[PDB]
């Protein structure tokens, strides 16, 4: 068997990444990459088949959700791409009120979870 399949949500655990030899009947295990929660229904394991190919791999992790952006006073928030890990919400004010602060707020990974690093502007 060759190097295990690469996924966009999961990465090989510590013993598997170092290992370079995979005989027939070998099970490797994945883990969620930063910013990705794990779907309970799917099991993150791959066996090596007799044709020296790995078993079908499906994404074993899903993107995390940043908290609700809240309600700004005297203005609106676009929320164009949703609130998943890596989003970007925009802020604006009504006619006669000047925006003070940041204009956007990316959903980034702050510690063990995802947070919006930018604070809310006042206008």
């Amino acid at each position: 068997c060759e190097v295990p399949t690469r996924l966009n949500s999961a990465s090989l655990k510590q013993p598997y990444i170092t290992q370079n030899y995979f005989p027939v009947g070998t099970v490797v295990e994945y883990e969620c990459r930063p910013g990705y929660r794990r779907e309970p229904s799917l099991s993150p394991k791959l066996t090596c088949l007799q044709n020296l190919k790995w078993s079908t791999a499906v994404e074993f992790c899903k993107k995390k959700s940043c908290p609700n952006p809240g309600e700004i006073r005297n203005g609106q928030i676009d929320v164009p791409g949703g609130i998943l890990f890596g989003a970007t919400i925009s802020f604006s004010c009504n006619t006669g009120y000047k925006l003070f602060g940041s204009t956007s707020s990316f959903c980034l990974i702050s510690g063990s979870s995802v947070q919006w690093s930018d604070p809310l502007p006042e206008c």
Binding site: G25, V27, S43, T47, L49, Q50, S55
Partner: protein, 256 residues
């Protein structure tokens, strides 16, 4: 003036009275009949025992506990050693039979639960190990029931059968099994289930020993429950009645 809750079924020298049962399910709308002379292939004259083989056979009971996953029976192999049905099946090469399944489970007004009785045609079952198929000593055991599992069977180098109840052993959702003739036993309503199944196959006749036409599965969807002080042993009994059975190809005994 009667009630549609009671029902009696007579077959051969056996009779089954339900007293409290739901309406009988009839296969795919078809009632089991004999093979027509325009659909036959084998040229020798068939035998039709009629009363000896077409009677109610009562298998050994099982127990419904609070954590029971479920049980399965391959229908041709359950009656393989029972009465004259098994004897004719051994000597003959080809057989063709319809069934009537009558599952019984009773309890008091203070017991709760729900079983699903499903007759699944061609229920091919997967294996714990991807490389090899499951063995016969694992797939089918006559004179007893085969039980499902609540946790995935460990993979490795074996010939076990994957028994996860949710995957049904066939890689399908257990909830979607209501496509095949199915009946529900609710302890607050029912006490028995009755399903009549015709002969289903891609061929007019077949060898019963090397091929199982249908597999009967009983699965507790809603668990069993009761309060302390009431009966804790609640069994489940299964009765099968071969219908319009006929055989072609009389030769030496045995399936060797």
């Amino acid at each position: 003036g009667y009630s549609d809750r009671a029902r009696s079924i007579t077959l051969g020298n056996s009779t089954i009275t339900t007293q409290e049962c739901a309406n009988v399910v009839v296969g795919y709308g078809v009632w089991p009949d004999y093979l027509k002379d325009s659909e036959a292939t084998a040229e020798d004259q068939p035998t039709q025992p009629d009363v000896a083989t077409c009677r109610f056979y009562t298998l050994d009971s099982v127990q419904w506990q609070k954590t029971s996953p479920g049980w399965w029976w391959k229908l041709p192999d359950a009656l393989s050693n029972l009465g004259l049905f098994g004897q004719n099946m051994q000597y003959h090469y080809l057989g063709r039979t319809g069934y009537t399944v009558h599952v019984q489970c009773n309890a008091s007004k203070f017991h709760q639960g729900c079983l699903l009785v499903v007759c699944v045609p061609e229920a091919e079952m997967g294996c714990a190990t991807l490389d090899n198929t499951p063995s016969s000593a694992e797939l089918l055991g006559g004179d007893s029931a085969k039980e499902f599992a609540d946790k995935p069977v460990a993979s490795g180098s074996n010939k076990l059968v994957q028994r996860v109840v949710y995957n049904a052993g066939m890689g399908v959702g257990v909830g979607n099994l209501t496509i095949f003739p199915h009946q529900w036993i609710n302890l607050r309503t029912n006490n028995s289930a009755t399903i009549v199944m015709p002969y289903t196959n891609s061929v007019p006749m077949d060898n019963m020993f090397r091929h199982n036409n249908v597999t009967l599965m009983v699965i507790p969807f809603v668990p069993l429950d009761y309060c302390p002080g009431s009966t804790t042993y609640v069994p489940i009994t299964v009765t099968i009645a071969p219908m319009c059975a006929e055989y072609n190809g009389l030769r030496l005994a045995g399936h060797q």
